[PDB]
C-alpha cells in the first residue's frame, strides 16, 4: 500500500493524471449506469418502449 501511494499519489503529476483518468472512467460508466437505471424505473413509459408498435 506504500507502493500504491508511491505510484499514484506521491508525484502531483501522477496524482492529477490519475484523477483525470478516473474522471474519464467515472464519467463514462456513470452515464451508462444512470441510463440503465432510468430505463428500469420508467419502464413502458418512454418512447423507446412504445416505438416497437410503429
Amino acid at each position: 500500500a506504500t507502493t500504491f501511494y508511491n505510484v499514484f499519489v506521491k508525484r502531483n503529476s501522477a496524482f492529477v493524471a490519475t484523477i483525470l483518468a478516473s474522471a474519464f472512467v467515472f464519467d463514462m460508466t456513470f452515464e451508462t449506469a444512470i441510463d440503465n437505471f432510468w430505463d428500469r424505473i420508467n419502464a413502458g413509459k418512454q418512447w423507446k418502449d412504445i416505438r416497437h408498435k410503429y
Binding site: 456513470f30 452515464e31 444512470i34 432510468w38 424505473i41 420508467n42 413502458g44 413509459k45 418512454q46 418512447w47 418502449d49 412504445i50 416505438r51 410503429y54
Partner: protein, 244 residues
C-alpha cells in the same frame, strides 16, 4: 377577492410525470396529440411546436412527415414572383386554425382561444388546471350565477364564465390503441400532451438532474470531510498561558 373571482383551485392529481424520477408516459402523449388534433385544433393553435418535435416523442419520422406533407405552407415566390404553396416538411410549425386574432375572435363570439404551446406553464396549476377545467363543466350552473350570453359556467376558470364550451364527451375521439375514450381519459391525455408541449425538455432535464444530484451530493459529503480535515489544526488548538 371572492373565491369565484379567483377560480376554484384544482386538485393535485398524481400525474405519471410527478415525481423526481418520473418521465411522461409517451403512450399518453401520443393519445393526447390525437385529442388535440381532433378536438382542440379546431380553435386553438400550437404555434411553437414543429413537426420535428413529435419525432421520437410521440411519432416515428415517417408518421410525422406524413402529417406535415398533408398540409400546404407558404413557399418562396415563383420566377414570375407569383406566390406559391408547398407541402409541409418536418421543420415547419404546426399551423393554426385561424390566420389572425380577428378571425379567431369572430369565430368564437368575441373570445380569443389562446395558443396552447405554453398554456401548461402559463396558468397556476399546470396540467392540473387543464385537467380540472376540461372535466369541470357542471351539467347545471350553480343556481343564481348569471352567465353572460355565449358563456359557459366552469368553476375552475377565474370569474366562472368561460367562452369555451364543454368539448369532451364520451367517444368524440376514437383512440388508435383501443383505450376507452372517456371524457376523463381524454382530458388526462390531452393535458399530458400540452404539458409536454410547454416543457419538451422535461424528461432530459430530470435525468440530468438525477446525475447532478448524485454528483453534487457526493461532492458535498467529500467537501465536508476535506474541510474538517484541513481545519483540524485550528479546531484542535490548545493554549497554555503563563502571565509574564
Amino acid at each position: 377577492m371572492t373565491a369565484a373571482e379567483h377560480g376554484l383551485h384544482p386538485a393535485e392529481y398524481p400525474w405519471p410525470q410527478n415525481g423526481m424520477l418520473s418521465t411522461f408516459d409517451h403512450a399518453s402523449l401520443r393519445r393526447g396529440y390525437q385529442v388535440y388534433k381532433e378536438v382542440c385544433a379546431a380553435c386553438h393553435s400550437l404555434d411553437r411546436i414543429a413537426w420535428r418535435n413529435l419525432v421520437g416523442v410521440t411519432h416515428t419520422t415517417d408518421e410525422a412527415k406524413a402529417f406535415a406533407e398533408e398540409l400546404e405552407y407558404d413557399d418562396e415566390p415563383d420566377d414570375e414572383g407569383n406566390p406559391r404553396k408547398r407541402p409541409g416538411k418536418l421543420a415547419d410549425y404546426i399551423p393554426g386554425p385561424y390566420p389572425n386574432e380577428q378571425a379567431a375572435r369572430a369565430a368564437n363570439q368575441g373570445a380569443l382561444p389562446p395558443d396552447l404551446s405554453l398554456i401548461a406553464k402559463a396558468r397556476h396549476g399546470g396540467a392540473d388546471y387543464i385537467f380540472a377545467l376540461l372535466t369541470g363543466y357542471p351539467d347545471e350552473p350553480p343556481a343564481g350565477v348569471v352567465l353572460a350570453p355565449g358563456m359557459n359556467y366552469n368553476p375552475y376558470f377565474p370569474g366562472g364564465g368561460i367562452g369555451m364550451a364543454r368539448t369532451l364527451f364520451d367517444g368524440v375521439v376514437e383512440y388508435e390503441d383501443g383505450t376507452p375514450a372517456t371524457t376523463s381519459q381524454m382530458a388526462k391525455d390531452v393535458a399530458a400532451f400540452l404539458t409536454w408541449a410547454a416543457e419538451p425538455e422535461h424528461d432530459e432535464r430530470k435525468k440530468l438532474g438525477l446525475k447532478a444530484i448524485i454528483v453534487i451530493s457526493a461532492m458535498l459529503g467529500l467537501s465536508v470531510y476535506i474541510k474538517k480535515f484541513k481545519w483540524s489544526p485550528i479546531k484542535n488548538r490548545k493554549f497554555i498561558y503563563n502571565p509574564p
